[PDB]
Every structure is written in structure tokens, then in C-alpha cells.
Amino acid sequence: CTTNNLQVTYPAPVAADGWEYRLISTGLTAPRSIVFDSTGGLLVLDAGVGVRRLTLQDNGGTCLSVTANATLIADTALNHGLAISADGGTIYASTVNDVYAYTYNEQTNTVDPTTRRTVVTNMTNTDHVTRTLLLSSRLPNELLVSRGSAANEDPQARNVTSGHSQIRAYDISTLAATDPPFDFVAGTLIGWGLRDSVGVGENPTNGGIWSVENSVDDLTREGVDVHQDNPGEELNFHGILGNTANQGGNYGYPDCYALWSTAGFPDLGALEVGDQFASDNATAGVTDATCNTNFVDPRLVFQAHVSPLDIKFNTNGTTAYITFHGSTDRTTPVGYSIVSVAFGLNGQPTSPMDSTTAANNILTSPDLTQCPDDCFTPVGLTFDTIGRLFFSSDSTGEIFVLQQS
Ligand SMILES: *[C@@H]1O[C@H](CO)[C@@H](O)[C@H](O)[C@H]1NC(C)=O
Ligand SMILES: *[C@@H]1O[C@H](CO)[C@@H](O)[C@H](O)[C@H]1NC(C)=O
Ligand SMILES: [Ca+2]
Ligand SMILES: [Ca+2]
């Protein structure tokens, strides 16, 4: 079954009925985004090291072993994002300021450092420093890049030209060898008002673009501290690449936040779960009505502070898997899990926007009071060619495989 028998060092994750998993790699520095190359190797963005390639021996199901590891790219500035071209010959990886493209030699499984070129630049800011990369499947030359806020409440997120808290799309086919990288704000605007939407994914049913949001910390409502269960994390819809419908809007940060818990909420009015409301620190003139009329509400909301970091859809588009990295801004911890959300034939969640039960648990921490110290912190997801799910846990240095049994 496996060459080595890696065991977790904390109360082990609990698999929902029908699911099984196995720990397949340990001792990584800080694994973030992951993706398979064309030769069946697993590329890992190990933050603070670079891009590592894990050689896997596959005996079927969860019976996988790492037999070797190689550092393809050594660059301590790479901190999260990673993508590979459809043809398998170009690796993309980002620092806080730039998105780099490297030529990957699939024959030798090596990257010549001198082939590196910058494709997007000027992304640097403090606080939220990850630059998530997604290459479209439907439009394989379209690269999306996510960029969060410079503070918990960043005023410059009100200025679209600042580049803060937004998702941009770049046609990489239009980029000559001679010409320089795009400026971050030169890309197509997928959305702004997105505090730190680290997770971005493409639904194969119709090509819909989806993002998951890490919402504001230490929320007050009419001065009252309501942060324990507000605001909700969010699933945001950005329409479809190569069209403008439902795309480019302002998702509300930092003037509007989405409602998770209605109990004890000051001035609830006619607000429902999922509706956005004005922040106590909203710019002068913004009210709850402004949030309803001028800003884009989330398609779904999730328990406050779960901190989602990735969203990946299955081949069918019937299910999206999301990593909940775990709370730091709540008294009892929440998250520390992998959940699924069901999607219908029109490419939308089957749950309504006021659902509090749309996230279905797949892998959960047995005892949330032990998190984060004794729990996994899921970050990146990726599917192999046969539908098995692989995910990283950055805090624990692990890679796991997950499948139905
Ligand atoms: C990056 O930003 C600087 C300062 O605004 C700008 O002058 C420079 O041209 C930008 N780089 C690119 C390639 O746009
Ligand atoms: C609003 O700003 C105040 C003062 O900076 C802060 O204490 C409070 O947490 C903020 N409320 C939010 C983020 O909802
Ligand atoms: Ca948060
Ligand atoms: Ca929002």
C-alpha cells in the first residue's frame, strides 16, 4: 500500500461517512498552493523556500508515497500562489510584489532560473501579502491574480486604482518576450471591495468565476462588539471570463460586510443572513441602503472567522471543495476543516443566499478547543487526473490525499 507510514501528531481529522484520507508528506516548511505537473509530480509552493516537486508512487486509492523531493525554484520571497500552464511548460509563482513565469522542462523536471520573466508587477502592500494565481481552464491564456488589503480596515480599498482588495485578469498570450510585465491595475477587474479573497476558482459547468473571502476582524455594529459570530465569510460570484455580466463590481469592503448571525445584531431592520450592511467605519454618507444598492452581496455566507483559503470544483461542477484555515479572532475556534458546497446545472449553489447550512463537512477537527496548536490548517487544494483531492496544511507542514472510499 505505502512505502512509509506517516502519522499525524495531533487528534486526527475526522472524515465524513464515505470519505477517507492519508497523510502523504511531512516536514514541509509552509505548504500553500499545490498543483500536479504533466509527469505526475506534485508541485508545492513551500512558502519561504520556493516551488518543490514531490515524486509520488501510486498504488491506488489513498495508497500514495513520496519517494523523492526536489527544489525546482529556490526563492524565499514566494509566499502562496502557484499555477501551471495547460501544456505543462510554464510555471507561474508570485511574491508580494510580482507574478513570475518560468520555463519548466518536463523532460528533465528542472527550471532554468534564467528563463524567469515578470508578467505582473507593483502588487506590494503590508498585512495581506499573498497573491493567489488561477489559470483559467475555459480560457487557458487568462491568468487571475488576487490581492488583499494593507490593513484590517484599509481606506485605500475605497480607491480602485490602489489595486488593494481586488481580483484582476491578465491575457498572458498578449505578452511578448521584449515587452515588460503588466501593472497590477492594467488587468481586467474581476471584482474589488474584496478584503482578502485568497481562494479563487472556475466552475467547469459554465466557466463561472468564484472567490472565498476572509472578512473583517473585530467587527462593531452601532459601537457594540458583535465580532464573535459576524461578519460571515463569503462565497462571491464574478460572472464568466470574456464577458462583463456580474463582473467588476465592488463586493463591499471596507464600507459593507455580510450578515451571518442575526441574533442580538443592533438595528437588524429587514436584514437577512447574506445581506450586507454598512460598517461602523464606513465613509461618511454610506448607510445600510447604500450597501444594498451600490455593492454586490455574496452568493453564500459561512460561519464568521472560518478563514477560507481555496475553492476547487469537481470535473462535473456539482461540488466545490473549500479549505477553512481556522479562526484566530474568535473565543471558541471555528474552521480547521475541508467542506463541500453543492452546485446546480446553472452553475450556482443549490443553497439559497440566506442558508446557514450550505457548507457540508468533509474532514473536520475532532475538538475545536485544541485549535490551532493541535489541529491541521488546510490551505491549498488540487485534483489529480482521476478525481482524488490533495490538500496542504501550512502550519503542520503536511500534504494529504482525500477521496471517497
Ligand atoms: C509600476 O509602478 C510604477 C509607479 O507607479 C510605474 O511608473 C511603473 O511603470 C509600473 N510598472 C509597470 C510595468 O507598469
Ligand atoms: C471600527 O473602527 C474602530 C476604531 O478603529 C475599531 O475599534 C472597530 O473594531 C472597527 N469596527 C469594525 C471593524 O467593524
Ligand atoms: Ca477575518
Ligand atoms: Ca462582501
Residue numbers in the entry: 26 to 430
Q: What do the paper's sentences say?
A:
A large additional electron density inside a pocket and a reorganization of the amino acids surrounding this electron density were observed in each of the eight structures. This organization is conserved in the native crystal, where the calcium ion is replaced by a water molecule.
Here we report the biochemical characterization of the AA12 enzyme encoded by the genome of the ascomycete Trichoderma reesei (TrAA12). TrAA12 preferentially oxidizes l-fucose, and weak activity was measured against d-arabinose (11.6% relative activity), d-galactose (5.7%), l-arabinose (2.8%), and d-lyxose (2.2%). Based on these results, the AA12 family of enzymes is likely to have a catalytic mechanism close to that of bacterial sGDH.
